Amino acid sequence: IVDHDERRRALADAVLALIAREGISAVTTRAVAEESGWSTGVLNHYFGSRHELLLAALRRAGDIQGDRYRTILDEEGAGPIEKLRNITASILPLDERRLAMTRVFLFFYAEGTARGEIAAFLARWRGVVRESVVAAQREGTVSTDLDADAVTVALVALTDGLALQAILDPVVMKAISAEDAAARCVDAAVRR
Amino acid sequence: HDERRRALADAVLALIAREGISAVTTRAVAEESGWSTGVLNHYFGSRHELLLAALRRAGDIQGDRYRTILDEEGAGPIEKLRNITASILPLDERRLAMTRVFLFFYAEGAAEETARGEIAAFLARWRGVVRESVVAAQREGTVSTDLDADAVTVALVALTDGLALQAILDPVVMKAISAEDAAARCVDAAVRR
Ligand SMILES: [Cl-]
């Protein structure tokens, strides 16, 4: 399932750019029209509610994230644990992309379909984590006494708690900005 | 006047537990509380003010829960960490309401300084009580001396909070956290047992 409308993709990207720069409150049809170079008429016929404009950004953020998973899983030489560290890092709001994604997801977390979008985001994230936990177990690096389902639920919950607190609380933002932060999350989940 | 404001905040929490944030209106809070809309209007200027009072009240009750837990005769540090952790999980009306109202304000705090500072105080209070118990366990020799108490604390609070927030929107996480041993498992993950 892909968005083929290059203009809608560009509009959703302008929304995310605005979210990273100025926060969700700065998103309006007028501000996005100004950011993107297209008319309020063009936007009003795509969306006609701020909610739909934000929802576009949520979906675009999810798609880019899915491409990140792909890049991470297909990296030559990387093992299950490196992949899990990379997946975990990719959720942490440590650059503009991930700052915008965390902000738009948090906005819709609270409003919750698209709690359907949220569910899809979570299920795909757990999906890629579970595969790599199971791969690490198969390699013998993670205890086969551990339930891969429980490990996955723990890692995803920890990572998301950190990502969400971090945008509210500079204590946690400092914590996740440490070079070893993703590796620490993974180690806690799989028990080193 | 101050007890009346508190009772009204309690009414908002009751609605939040039962039917969600969207159920909070002047009329519903009057019906729930027994106070007329004119008494409500005296204390609160807006629906948003009702919700902020609920956030503050939920945090205050949670503060009293910490003190009850920390004061339990014969409870050890690990037991206290377990009970602290469980006290956050949305497993009854109190904790369901609390998680729902915090989630609302997390989203708001992702934009507004007033709500952000309320969330920050709550998280710091919670880390403070967790850290006390983590260091007490290290001092008794039951938690590894080679772990950094602050890092363990950040991790446990983030895990517990991630699970509580995910639980109110994800039925499988809700199922996971309602297992008797859920809080024990969170503590063990965080202290790298
Ligand atoms: Cl409790």
If helices are DSSP runs of H or I spanning 4 or more residues, what is the number of helices of chain A?
10
Q: Order of helices and strands of chain A, N to C?
A: HHHHHHHHHH
Total domain count of chain A: 1
Number of strands of chain A: 0
Tell me roughly what share of residues is in helical segments of chain A: over 70%
Q: Based on the structure, what is the oligomeric state of the protein chains?
A: homodimer
Globally, the shape of chain A reads elongated
CATH superfamily (homologous) name of chain A: Tetracycline Repressor, domain 2
- Mind describing the biggest β-sheet of chain A? none
| Ligands and ions found | chloride ion
Structural class of chain A: mainly alpha
Could you name the CATH topology of chain A?
Tetracycline Repressor, domain 2
Using a beta-carbon cutoff below 8 angstroms, give the protein chain pair with the largest interface and the number of residues from each chain. Answer: A-B, 39 and 38 residues
Distance between the termini of chain A: 37 Å
What's the alpha carbon Rg of chain A, rounded to whole Å?
A: 18 Å
| Portion in strands of chain A | under 5%
Q: Which CATH-level-2 architecture of chain A?
A: Orthogonal Bundle
